[PDB]
Amino acid sequence: GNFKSKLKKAMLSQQITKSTIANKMRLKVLSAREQSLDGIFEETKEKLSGIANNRDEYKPILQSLIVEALLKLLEPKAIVKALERDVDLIESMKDDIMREYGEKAQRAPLEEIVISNDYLNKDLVSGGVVVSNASDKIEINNTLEERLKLLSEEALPAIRLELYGPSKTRKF
């Protein structure tokens, strides 16, 4: 009985040795796609920083990001937190932003749009803004890095459909 149990144990330990080798090789393939995926977002982050450095096509983008965050807050006052580079642009387009919020929200225009003395991290944030509550409680991290993170979380099935063909074993 001990020999039979040892044979069964050796037979059972034989399958595990093949199973562990199979799982490790299958996870290497899965981690290859995630490594290829991260290369896309790493290349996308570099391209996003290029859009911020244009300073000519960034102003239409930068104004849109504030209005997009302002329309979500839906309050007459806000505290825009932008990079130290963008403060001049924000102060230049404050009036246009207030008018756009007044027009896009079908409500009286923004009362005031304060630019916080505190600034975003230069290295961490490629561009964008972080529009916050008048009390600085409710904030919208509308930065380009945060938007890219949200896109990487959301559009992952679409990215898979773009890179690879539709799954062969997915009937419906």
- Within 13 Å, how many C-alpha atoms sit on residue 150's CB side? 8
Least distance CB 145 / another protein (angstroms) = 10
Least distance CB 146 / another protein (angstroms) = 7
Can residue 16 be called a binding residue for another protein (CB under 8 A)? yes
- Other Cβ atoms within 10 Å of 97 Cβ, number: 24
Question: How far is the C-alpha of 69 from the C-alpha of 76, rounded, in Å?
Answer: 13
Query: Which C-beta is closer to another protein: that of 28 or that of 108?
Result: 28
Q: Is 128 strand, coil or helix? A: coil
Work out the end-to-end distance of the chain between its first and last CA atoms, rounded to an integer number of angstroms: 51
Can residue 19 be called a binding residue for another protein (CB under 8 A)? yes
Q: Give the count of residues interacting with another protein (CB under 8 A).
A: 77
Can residue 55 be called a binding residue for another protein (CB under 8 A)? no
Can residue 69 be called a binding residue for another protein (CB under 8 A)? yes
Gap positions in the chain, given as the residue before each gap (C–N > 2.5 A)?
none
Can residue 53 be called a binding residue for another protein (CB under 8 A)? no
Can residue 34 be called a binding residue for another protein (CB under 8 A)? yes
Using alpha carbons, list the distances in angstroms from residue 113 to 28, 80, 109, 129.
50, 7, 11, 13
Least distance CB 9 / another protein (angstroms) = 9
Note whether 84 and 115 are within 8 A (CB).
Answer: no
Can residue 13 be called a binding residue for another protein (CB under 8 A)? yes
Select the span of 8-16, 79-87, 88-96, 108-116 touching another protein (CB under 8 A): 8-16
Tell me which residues in 87-146 interact with another protein (CB under 8 A): 100, 104-106, 137-142, 144, 146
